């Protein structure tokens, strides 16, 4: 994949 | 490979890629530890 983005809080089922 | 960290949130995308937001730090990364 691409460089990866700024950092955030997670949304994960 | 083995161990993951106390603070690394995982941020997960459907597209099947893991990538890094460690909220303690601040770092982002691709590499996930867990494999």
Same mark, same amino acid.
């Given at each position: 994949?691409?460089?990866?983005?700024?950092?955030?809080?997670?949304?994960?089922? | 490979?083995?161990?993951?960290?106390?603070?690394?949130?995982? /941020? #997960?995308?459907? #597209?099947? /890629?893991?990538?890094?937001?460690?909220? $303690? $730090? /601040?770092?982002?990364?691709?590499?996930?530890? /867990?494999?």
């Amino acid at each position: 994949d691409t460089p990866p983005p700024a950092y955030l809080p997670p949304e994960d089922p | 490979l083995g161990p993951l960290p106390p603070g690394w949130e995982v /941020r #997960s995308t459907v #597209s099947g /890629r893991i990538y890094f937001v460690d909220h $303690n $730090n /601040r770092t982002t990364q691709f590499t996930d530890p /867990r494999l």
